[PDB]
Symmetry: C11
Subunit: 69 residues, 11 copies
Amino acid sequence: SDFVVIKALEDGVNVIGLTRGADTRFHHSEKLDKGEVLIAQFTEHTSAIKVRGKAYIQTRHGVIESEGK
Amino acid sequence: SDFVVIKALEDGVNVIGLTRGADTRFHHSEKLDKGEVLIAQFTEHTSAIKVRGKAYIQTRHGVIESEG
Amino acid sequence: SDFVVIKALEDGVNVIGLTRGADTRFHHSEKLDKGEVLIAQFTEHTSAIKVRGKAYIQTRHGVIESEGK
Amino acid sequence: NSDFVVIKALEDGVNVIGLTRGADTRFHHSEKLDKGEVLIAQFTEHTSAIKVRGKAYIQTRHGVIESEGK
Amino acid sequence: SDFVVIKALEDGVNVIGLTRGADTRFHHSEKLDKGEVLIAQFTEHTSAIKVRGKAYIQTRHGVIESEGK
Amino acid sequence: SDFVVIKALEDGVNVIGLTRGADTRFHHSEKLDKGEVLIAQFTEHTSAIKVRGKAYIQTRHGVIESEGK
Amino acid sequence: NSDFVVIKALEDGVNVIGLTRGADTRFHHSEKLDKGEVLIAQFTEHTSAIKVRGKAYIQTRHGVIESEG
Amino acid sequence: SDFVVIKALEDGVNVIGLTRGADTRFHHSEKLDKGEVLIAQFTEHTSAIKVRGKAYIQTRHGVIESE
Amino acid sequence: SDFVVIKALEDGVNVIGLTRGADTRFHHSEKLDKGEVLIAQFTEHTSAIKVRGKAYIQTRHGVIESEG
Amino acid sequence: SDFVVIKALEDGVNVIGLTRGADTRFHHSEKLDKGEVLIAQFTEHTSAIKVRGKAYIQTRHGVIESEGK
Amino acid sequence: SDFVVIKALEDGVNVIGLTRGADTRFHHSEKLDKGEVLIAQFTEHTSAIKVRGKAYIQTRHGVIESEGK
Ligand SMILES: N[C@@H](Cc1c[nH]c2ccccc12)C(=O)O
Ligand SMILES: N[C@@H](Cc1c[nH]c2ccccc12)C(=O)O
Ligand SMILES: N[C@@H](Cc1c[nH]c2ccccc12)C(=O)O
Ligand SMILES: N[C@@H](Cc1c[nH]c2ccccc12)C(=O)O
Ligand SMILES: N[C@@H](Cc1c[nH]c2ccccc12)C(=O)O
Ligand SMILES: N[C@@H](Cc1c[nH]c2ccccc12)C(=O)O
Ligand SMILES: N[C@@H](Cc1c[nH]c2ccccc12)C(=O)O
Ligand SMILES: N[C@@H](Cc1c[nH]c2ccccc12)C(=O)O
Ligand SMILES: N[C@@H](Cc1c[nH]c2ccccc12)C(=O)O
Ligand SMILES: N[C@@H](Cc1c[nH]c2ccccc12)C(=O)O
Ligand SMILES: N[C@@H](Cc1c[nH]c2ccccc12)C(=O)O
Ligand SMILES: N[C@@H](Cc1c[nH]c2ccccc12)C(=O)O
């Protein structure tokens, strides 16, 4: 299954997993401090990921940067 | 399944999931504020995605921008 | 399954689903206003899509533009 | 899933015709397009060949081709 | 399955379906007039396709042109 | 399944299908006259194809040309 | 046949953390790398996201990324 | 399944099919005269192909010529 | 399944297999002397590989070098 | 499965098939004379192939040449 | 499965198969003299291959060369 790379460019970046299925809510929030890298798959439980905070993001479609709050 | 990357370029962008199946209605609207990124798949429940508001969007077919 | 990206270049664009199966009819018309984007799959229920109105469209085969009357 | 064709009508009354899959061949559906309208259509359980009549711009996995009307 | 694109470059082009199976014969002859485009798959019933008449043909292997007479 | 494109460069080109299975014999010869095009698959019944006569041939491995005597 | 990440520690004490697959998300394992060591780790039935903490050079299918201490 | 293209550059080229399985023998030899093309798959019955005689051959790996 | 190529650039390189499953520990350490090459898959038993010592490594993602 | 192309550059080249399974022995040696070409698959019975003698070899990984004793 | 090409650049090269499974031991050592080429798969019985001696090696990842003691 696909995965997303997220590198925190500041402290407190929040990588939020949203529930697969008929209902949509977050099920997990993973906090990243500056410089930490999370490599996360889509899964049986996670069908959408949201990033809040300043982060450098790689996906199969190229690079994208989130900008915090 | 494929996924779409949506970066909100203003506050209040809405990423709306349309229901898979014989009926078509909005089942969920994810609101993004300026700068937030959402990476969303097509799924058993979502067969079409609508973006309303200013956003930078990446799919397998390239980049496209919605305008509010 | 494949998908189409449609960006409305004017108000009142219609993205119309045609029914899969021995019967062919419109089962849904999604109305888009200027600047809105719709990313739509082929599915069990939809085996052809028709765009009416001015829109920028991306498929696996590249870009194409529909023009309104 | 299956391949699809993009058809952009370059004049009014373009006619996209779906031919029956199976041992017999006849049209089962005719979808008329006005100028500027786009139809994106798959091959399916019911449609194993597609004919285009009228002036249109067509994209497939093999590239671009243009039909020209009678 | 794969498919062939055939554009008739004169009237009365024949796109002919040969039967899949232990026996080989024509099961259908589609007649195309000048300018008409046919996009045709290999199928359960059709394992070979013959083009007679002047036509521009695209397959996965590139372009080829039939010539009538 | 793969397919071969064959364009007859003279009259009476023969595209011959050889039987899939423990035995190897000709099961069908398709005659092409100059300018006709045959697009033929490998199948449940056909596991090798022989061309005799002058013809332009395209496969996944590129172009080749048969020559008659 | 899953995807994998390559992690080369650029300083002592780098942590490569596996997060559990499923409805529950927690760290299940932390592999400590010292400077110069390389770990090549797959996504698995038990690991659906990987966090890197500490200075490291990382390779995925999406290209290179660096974690910062 | 993959296939090989063989164009005979002289008369009497032999394309030979070797048996798949625990045993290896020739089950079929197809004779090609000059200019004839044979496009042949690997199969349930044929797991190796031998070309004897001068021929132009194309595979997924490129061109090669027998002598 | 993917595989890694490891060429020992000094004696005593260790290519270590980590156990697939809920639990994680090293189950094997293959020792390589200078100039030897090991080509190793991921497998039912091995879901992560650690290289310790100076080595030239090739994967589907390109080259990387471990250092002593 | 994949296959290897072997062209003998001298007489008496040997293409040897090693047995798939817990045991490893030669089960078949195909002798090639100069100029002959053998296109051989990996199979249920053959999991490794050894070439002895001067030959030009093509695989999916490129060209290699074996050199006679 | 993937395979490795090994060309011995000196006499006495050893291509060693390591056992697939919870235990890891050498099950077979194929000895190659100078110029011989071995093309070997990963298999049900072999999940890791070791090359000892001077040899030119091709894999899907490119060329690598082993150097003898
Ligand atoms: N629960 C929703 C989550 C989701 C995925 N993609 C989306 C796109 C838009 C809105 C919601 C979603 C689903 O699995 O379908
Ligand atoms: N319920 C529809 C939603 C949809 C997907 N793609 C479409 C294209 C046009 C109209 C509606 C749709 C379906 O699953 O088929
Ligand atoms: N109901 C038709 C719809 C359709 C798909 N592609 C077409 C092409 C031409 C005409 C109709 C169609 C079917 O599923 O086959
Ligand atoms: N009924 C025919 C339609 C068709 C598909 N491709 C063709 C090519 C030639 C002629 C007819 C066909 C079939 O399903 O086989
Ligand atoms: N009935 C034959 C038709 C055919 C397909 N490919 C061919 C090549 C040569 C001759 C005939 C054929 C078959 O299905 O096998
Ligand atoms: N009956 C043979 C036909 C064949 C296919 N490829 C070949 C190569 C050589 C000789 C014969 C063949 C088979 O199905 O296996
Ligand atoms: N337990 C979560 C772990 C996870 C994977 N990707 C994520 C993205 C965001 C948050 C959590 C996750 C799951 O398997 O789905
Ligand atoms: N009967 C042998 C034929 C064979 C295929 N590839 C080979 C390579 C070497 C020697 C023999 C073979 C097999 O199916 O395995
Ligand atoms: N036992 C773990 C080993 C592992 C694989 N990838 C990892 C990433 C991080 C930590 C541990 C691992 C597993 O199979 O899931
Ligand atoms: N019988 C061994 C043959 C083999 C394949 N690849 C190898 C690599 C090294 C040594 C032996 C082999 C196997 O099937 O596993
Ligand atoms: N018996 C081990 C062999 C192995 C494959 N890859 C490895 C990497 C490291 C150590 C051992 C291995 C296995 O099948 O898993
Ligand atoms: N010999 C090893 C690995 C092993 C072999 N057979 C096993 C069966 C089950 C668990 C582990 C093993 C050990 O005892 O750990």
